[PDB]
């Protein structure tokens, strides 16, 4: 297709490896570029941790209000929200919001702990039919993004399908799905990524991720005005361990996909 030629040209111009999956919910059509290759998830994995806690709250109705202590020893490398609450508590709701909307790594580690470790996050993925996602490490080491390392990876196709199920499908209860959507729509880290390649009038909920090897990711649900929503996953990684982030590549991929509809 024209879109795949343009995405391949974009990739060639970028020097890295680009993975894209689009699901158009109007007809369930899919556009894939390197759709079945593994990419490091980096912070995009926080969506799965938050959703797993939301799933627990379907049975434990008050779980999201449970206070969780933030101690100095809990702080890792990037904790914009948790740092404001050291020697205090945050609820699981506040930690989920922080992990999603500010990419707080301490918050992610608390969500992982609540689930019984990375294996508990992976288990949730398996329970909703995602056989590809794997979370192996906690923050910050899950972002090493080493070429060829399968730890902490997924594929674009799998993540697009999973994100669709979590936000537009019924993998979560109705209250929980709405909460997840609200959290994603309120993300603060995404202005230069998928959002930057889309009409300003469209509503986007997204989760970015970045890591070593210049890994630059974004996963989004998109509500165009007057049209069925879309799910778009854009993963990008580079050959040099110290490469700089390339959010512009994600914006450009989003622009190419949007042109094709």
Author numbering: 27 to 57, 59 to 238, 240 to 289
From the paper:
As a reference, the TapeDrive was also used to collect serial data of the native CTX-M-14 crystals. In the native enzyme, this site is occupied by a tetrahedral anion, such as a phosphate (PDB code 4ua640) or a sulfate (PDB code 7q0z13), as in the structures we refined. The rotationally disordered sulfate occupies two slightly displaced alternative positions in the native enzyme (SO4-A and SO4-B, S to S distance of 0.4 Å). The alternative sulfates (A/B) are coordinated via hydrogen bonds with the side chains of Ser70 (3.1 Å/3.4 Å), Thr235 (3.1 Å/3.3 Å) and Ser237 (3.4 Å/2.8 Å) as well as the main chain nitrogen of Ser237 (3.1 Å/3.2 Å). SO4-B forms additional hydrogen bonds with side chains of Ser130 (2.9 Å) and Lys234 (3.2 Å). The obtained refined time-resolved crystal structures provided insight into the molecular kinetics of the binding of boric acid. Starting from the native CTX-M-14 structure, the above-mentioned sulfate and some water molecules (notably OW174, OW352, OW353 and the catalytic OW10) are present in the active site well-defined in the electron density maps. Initially, in the native enzyme, the alternative positioned sulfate ions refined to occupancies of 47% and 44% for SO4-A and SO4-B, respectively.
